[PDB]
Amino acid sequence: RPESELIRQSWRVVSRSPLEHGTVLFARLFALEPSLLPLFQYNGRQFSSPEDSLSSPEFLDHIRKVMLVIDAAVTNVEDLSSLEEYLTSLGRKHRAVGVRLSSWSTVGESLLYMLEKSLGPDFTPATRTAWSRLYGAVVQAMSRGWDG
Numbered sequence: 001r002p003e004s005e006l007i008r009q010s011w012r013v014v015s016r017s018p019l020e021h022g023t024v025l026f027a028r029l030f031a032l033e034p035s036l037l038p039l040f041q042y043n044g045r046q047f048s049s050p051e052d053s054l055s056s057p058e059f060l061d062h063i064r065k066v067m068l069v070i071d072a073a074v075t076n077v078e079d080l081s082s083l084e085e086y087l088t089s090l091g092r093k094h095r096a097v098g099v100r101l102s103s104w105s106t107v108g109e110s111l112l113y114m115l116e117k118s119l120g121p122d123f124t125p126a127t128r129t130a131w132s133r134l135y136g137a138v139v140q141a142m143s144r145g146w147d148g
């Protein structure tokens with residue numbers, strides 16, 4: 001695939017500094033869908049504002065976890081079937097946390113925004129298409145966690 005190469009090349013730029021980039025992803029996400037903010041319940045407390053989340057070590061650790069799952073998907077882009085069972089359980093966990101299926105599309109748009117802003121001119125419509133497809137496939141596996 002030429003898509004798989006576009007993904008690997010674009011990810012190299014981002015994975016240089018995963019917290020900085022994942023911070024962008026989450027800041028964008030809460031800008032679009034502020035109702036996701038209460039789902040992060042560290043020590044039984046909710047964040048009042050999006051900027052509160054950025055001072056939480058647990059929240060920042062979650063950004064790292066996110067970037068690592070995406071790294072795994074990129075590493076396995078040629079065959080994502082090997083992550084399917086893991087992603088299904090990840091889906092189930094997030095359903096339990098309170099993430100709705102519809103919110104995954106917002107996460108996807110936030111990921112695309114982060115890529116667009118990091119790559120600028122290098123974020124070509126083919127790169128965008130490749131990432132939408134990869135992310136779509138991740139979500140599809142995760143959505144198998146919603147059957148019950």
Ligand code: HEM
Nearest residue numbers: 036039040041058062065066069070093094097099103107
């Ligand atoms: C709306 C988006 C999301 C919300 C509200 C959310 C919320 C949470 C919460 C509350 C936890 C449990 C506490 C913690 O470990 O920090 C969690 C765990 C986790 N999240 Fe997310 N999350 C989101 C998106 C994602 C995405 C997109 C990924 C990866 C693609 C991801 C990967 C993880 C991982 C790997 C864990 C640890 C799961 C485990 O093994 O127990 N999360 N998430």
